[PDB]
């Protein structure tokens with residue numbers, strides 16, 4: 012398509028981004044997101060899709076890398092995805108990533124609630140330091 | 142690296158693009174970055190099958206993986222473009238070769254002449270041969286064959302005589318391709334005296350077997366069931382330098398047969414080429430398109446291709462019947478409809494099916510016939526003189 | 527908001543003889559401060 | 567060389583606020599046949615942050631708590647005044663406009679109150695576009711039975727409140743506020759069309775307020791506003807802030823979003839106006855025929871999530887069309903062009919079936935508005951409302967035609 016001089020549709024890039032996440036290819040998923048920004052598209056929706064695919068396909072470690080890069084870059088995720096990332100990290104004992112995300116969640120403008128704190132406490136209660 | 146490059150070279154030599162694509166995918170699936178030579182073999186295979194879109198993707202992918210193209214890579218494109226007459230794309234390489242620090246060797250000049258010739262630019266073809274001698278260099282045997290085809294195409298009997306006799310003036314024994322071009326220029330001008338003079342030279346040919354068999358089969362001596370096995374024996378022997386040499390041999394042979402009136406024999410010779418993989422893009426027959434692609438053929442070969450295609454049309458419906466005479470960037474311009482191939486095909490179609498095939502308003506190098514008009518349609522007589 | 531948590535602590539404890547040795551290694555065995563002649 | 571080379575509002579309009587610490591920066595108040603407005607008096611260049619456009623001191627406002635108990639900020643009602651009993655007798659949920667109307671009429675009666683002066687720049691009973699002032703004939707031009715019944719209930723509620731609380735036995739200090747029902751109806755109309763509800767912190771107390779804010783109730787509505795309101799607690803000043811990074815040209819109108827996410831029938835009920843480019847207007851389709859949501863959004867370059875659609879022909883009506891059209895979506899399944907044309911054709915037929923329900927068309931309503939010479943403000947508002955809905959349905963037919971062709 013690029014070699015034919017045609018401009019890929021925003022939906023075409025999203026199909027490639029979602030496919031990359033299903034295979035756990037975060038590097039290719041991030042390369043395609045950079046292309047959409049170069050094509051002057053809106054990468055927020057495609058970034059949301061990429062993170063959810065990695066979480067669904069048990070690539071939580073890769074999902075955190077992609078999520079934080081977008082969140083630190085200024086993009087604001089959905090409240091559903093915020094609750095997804097915090098909870099899945101705390102179920103896996105990853106307090107460091109769950110605390111980083113919750114800090115970015117409030118920086119965006121979404122204040123943490125009792126649900127998010129209960130996720131962090133689930134890991135803090137097992138560290139041996141009350 | 143040694144095994145991958147060895148197989149891909151064979152695929153590029155024989156024009157097996159499907160196998161070449163699988164080797165490339167196999168290398169990528171194993172996290173192996175193919176070498177710059179390996180991609181050049183894949184680019185070669187696509188050009189053998191006239192798959193320019195997939196060839197330029199591989200060329201684009203070479204820079205992506207850091208396997209920058211070598212001098213041989215810019216030759217695989219030039220010969221691929223030369224066969225199709227895509228001198229617009231050939232000049233892109235030439236304008237790129239000077240900027241890339243690569244001087245113009247002899248092989249670059251041969252492709253330039255071949256590209257201009259197939260594109261109908263006769264004036265610019267001889268100018269390259271005129272400008273080639275100024276830059277010294279050393280014209281090889283194919284260069285003489287490259288410029289002889291230019292004179293033979295534009296019906297220059299006296300120029301072709303001087304070019305041909307000088308080929309044997311150095312004791313070179315010109316190949317069968319040059320002999321078939323002599324028969325075309327003599328057959329185009331109806332010079333039956335010179336045709337018989339050259340044929341007797343090919344009938345003895347104590348040194349070269351191919352000239353004897355091909356020369357004999359043109360006259361019709363080998364048109365028997367058992368006597369067609371010897372002709373096929375030569376074709377199989379020539380079917381070993383790949384599709385690159387084969388396409389040149391069959392283009393000259395069909396051109397000679399058509400101008401000599403052996404139009405039914407040209408039909409069977411073309412049928413021999415297709416089953417060997419020559420002209421893989423020649424025909425498409427599906428529910429959407431019935432197409433014949435003649436942009437890589439000579440004028441005699443194109444007439445044979447159209448004649449068979451028209452006869453097979455009347456036997457049988459697709460949404461469209463098309464003739465692809467120009468296949469490149471020239472399509473999106475008014476020059477493609479003025480190409481010698483486009484005019485020849487349209488003129489040929491006009492006095493064979495009346496006014497049933499008209500040009501396209503969206504492409505310069507297409508000659509279409511709608512499904513509705515296909516209802517209002519042997520159509521072409523195939524006989525030996 | 528979530529507090530910027532900062533957990534730092536210091537403790538004093540009685541020291542084992544083993545920890546005393548680990549500090550030094552280093553045994554001072556002479557009551558001399560400085561040599562009279564070399565001033566070393 | 568230099569030698570060889572909408573009317574402005576009453577100058578006293580800004581001055582009465584200006585002598586009381588109202589500040590306007592780079593904007594001017596201009597008056598036209600349709601009413602007041604705020605326009606950029608110069609090219610407002612973009613900055614890294616929101617620019618201060620206007621500053622309105624708290625003491626010039628009339629505010630009441632949204633939630634019970636009813637406290638007034640600033641407190642202007644004396645202890646024991648009978649107006650509080652009238653305010654205190656209201657329904658806490660529905661009668662917020664009655665409470666503000668009582669405060670508004672009370673404020674006009676006070677000699678020192680700012681709204682005694684500012685009240686002269688409020689639209690009169692024949693100039694306010696609120697449907698509370700609309701006659702039964704004006705409501706007949708709406709062509710919307712649901713909205714008409716809503717307005718009739720509003721007028722009934724407002725009238726019964728006046729008859730109950732402004733009877734013959736009430737004190738003179740109450741009678742002189744609303745001597746007639748029309749005076750109280752006008753006050754409720756001002757309350758509905760001009761009330762600004764915000765969460766504010768005053769001192770240490772954070773609360774929701776219904777506020778009558780002078781010079782900020784002159785900002786017109788837009789669903790793509792270039793300004794927003796911001797309460798500054800430290801000095802009790804309402805700030806009108808232009809969007810950060812947004813360049814505003816000289817003469818461009820300064821607008822805020824009165825009602826995010828609200829349809830035109832809600833804008834008509836509250837503020838007595840409608841917009842043809844409302845991105846939240848809806849049209850009742852059967853759902854038998856559906857188009858591809860992803861294709862429709864990409865054809866018109868509508869990006870973002872459904873609740874935050876934006877355009878990178880396309881306006882708020884096309885965004886509204888995306889939200890209201892029957893749509894299907896199967897992750898990344900592509901739509902068949904021949905099946906989508908059947909849906910587009912069937913959706914356009916249903917759109918024309920609804921345009922045929924109206925006795926007139928959109929351009930006939932537009933020429934009727936130009937031919938008016940003695941029409942009430944609400945009559946023209948009623949015609950503009952039905953015309954905008956026709957323009958919205960007509961925009962959908964055009965958008966579907968474009969979408970059907972750009973799918974090739």
Ligand SMILES: Nc1ncnc2c1ncn2[C@@H]1O[C@H](CSCC[C@H](N)C(=O)O)[C@@H](O)[C@H]1O
Nearest residue numbers: 601602695759783784785786787837838839
């Ligand atoms: N976008 C818009 N289109 C039409 N009328 C509008 C509008 N925004 C605001 N209005 C009108 O302005 C009123 C809100 S108070 C805004 C100032 C008003 N124009 C005045 O002169 O006092 C509403 O009653 C409504 O009728």
